């Protein structure tokens, strides 16, 4: 008559690592590393992401002709740019503080686009038509941004213009505009009619006076002239005043912003699908309660901590010895 003390065993082929010994088959173990995603860009809290397609942030906000699909956009859970998002600034020039603007949009969940300076009403003594360029062509014909208005001289006359907007929206208003810099004095006169002009912008915290820098430069998209793009966040109750004797690319449409946290801009060629998740990555969505993942550093929502590890298996059972 005997009694023996012994331990459990099974057919488990799971292996863990120790400091003294690698590949130690054990009876039980949990994987702490999530490496399985969705291959799809999903909604977040019911709200779908905003695909910019071939357009980038600049194109979407300025109103680049190739981005007319986004004119409808108003709310999103995050912002997606692709590898083919190159339609932004069609007329060559510098978008001042562009990187900071993107950063601002990263904490914007939605907005109400509105006609800040109505193209037909706001410019009696100036010429609102005829403000197009071959570098912003659409349907094979010259066009321009949908949110900006390129003002020009009305019959060899460009009187000083003055136009103010008061923010009665209860939110920040994002106001974009542009200043144009022709290649020759000949062009300056034929566009504005004043040889020496200026644009001035002033709010409660903004104040500048732009003067056209007329020079000859390498043609970009057929254009030897340059056009610089500016923006500002107009606070509730604040006023923004525009004055110009030429070279003003006027604000036509503006955006009343709504702030929210957890939003961001990612780059992804993954397809958007009618799907929902609490953790999104550029590779795809993640459904997991694990502490770690090796899918992607870029994350939106609630996600496992990213890590370079290929394997993170923590043993729970004992060394497995079937000894058959």
């Amino acid at each position: 008559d005997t009694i023996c003390i012994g331990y459990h065993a099974n057919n488990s082929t799971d292996t863990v690592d120790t400091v003294l010994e690698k590949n130690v088959t054990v009876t039980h173990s949990v994987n702490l590393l999530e490496d399985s995603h969705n291959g799809k860009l999903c909604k977040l809290k019911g709200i779908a992401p905003l695909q910019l397609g071939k357009c980038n942030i600049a194109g979407w906000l300025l109103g680049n002709p190739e981005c007319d699909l986004l004119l409808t956009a108003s709310s999103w859970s995050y912002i997606v740019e692709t590898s083919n998002s190159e339609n932004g600034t069609c007329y060559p020039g510098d978008f001042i503080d562009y990187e900071e603007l993107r950063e601002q949009l990263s904490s914007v969940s939605s907005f109400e686009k509105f006609e800040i300076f109505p193209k037909t009403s706001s410019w009696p003594n100036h010429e609102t038509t005829k403000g197009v360029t071959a570098a912003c062509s659409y349907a094979g014909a010259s066009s321009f941004y949908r949110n900006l208005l390129w003002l020009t001289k009305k019959g060899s006359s460009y009187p000083k213009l003055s136009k103010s907007y008061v923010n009665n929206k209860g939110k920040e208003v994002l106001v974009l505009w542009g200043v144009h810099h022709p290649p020759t004095g000949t062009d300056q006169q034929s566009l504005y009619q004043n040889a020496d002009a200026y644009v001035s912008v002033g709010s409660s915290k903004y104040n500048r006076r732009f003067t056209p820098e007329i020079a000859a430069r390498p043609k970009v998209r057929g254009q030897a002239g340059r056009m610089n793009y500016y923006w500002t966040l107009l606070e509730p109750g604040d006023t923004i005043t525009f004055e110009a004797t030429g070279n003003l690319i006027a604000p036509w449409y503006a955006f009343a912003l709504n702030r929210g946290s957890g939003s961001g801009i990612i780059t992804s060629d993954a397809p958007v699908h009618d799907c929902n998740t609490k953790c999104q990555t550029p590779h795809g969505a993640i459904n997991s309660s694990l502490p770690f993942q090796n899918i992607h550093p870029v994350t939106i929502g609630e996600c496992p901590k990213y890590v370079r590890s290929t394997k993170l298996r923590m043993a729970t059972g004992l060394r497995n010895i079937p000894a058959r």
Partner: protein, 164 residues
């Protein structure tokens, strides 16, 4: 084995006992069979479960984390940002993998210790009434039946002794 029990003085494990981690075998006049020790198997399950939950607790989930853009005159700042990201990544990868290695060692030794302790609880219960063979087996002198066997795997043995 740090405690010389598992894969030590108990050469192998039993594929046959499927009720728990630690247990007994017992051969009797009434028959053979396996039986797992609830007491010790449970504590190991409470302890291991707690270890796993504690590990997961220290590793807080990562929230919204996107990348920033920098213009061509912001290379130093872009490189600072990159040094920060790669940096924290080196450390968390290190902490993660390293914690698992260390804890895995502790866990295997934990079980090893649990078997060694069980064996010695019995050995000090029987004493003369049995001789220690090998493989952590106890050959009874006083011939014990199924009802008595349950007193051993119970901690309520009783002692009636002759020889031997």
């Amino acid at each position: 084995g740090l405690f010389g029990a598992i894969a030590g003085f108990i050469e192998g494990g039993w594929t046959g006992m499927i009720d728990g981690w630690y247990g007994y075998h017992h051969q009797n006049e009434q028959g053979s069979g396996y039986a797992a020790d609830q007491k010790s198997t449970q504590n190991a399950i409470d302890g291991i479960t707690n270890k796993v939950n504690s590990v997961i607790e220290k590793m807080n989930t990562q929230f919204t984390a996107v990348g920033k853009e920098f213009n061509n005159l912001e290379r130093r700042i872009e490189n600072l940002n990159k040094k920060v990201d790669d940096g924290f990544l080196d450390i968390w990868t290190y902490n993660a993998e390293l914690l698992v290695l260390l804890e895995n060692e502790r866990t295997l030794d934990f079980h090893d210790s649990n078997v060694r302790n069980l064996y010695e609880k019995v050995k000090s219960q029987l004493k003369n009434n049995a001789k220690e063979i090998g493989n952590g087996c106890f050959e009874f002198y006083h011939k014990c039946d199924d009802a008595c066997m349950e007193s051993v795997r119970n901690g309520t043995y009783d002692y009636p002794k002759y020889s031997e």
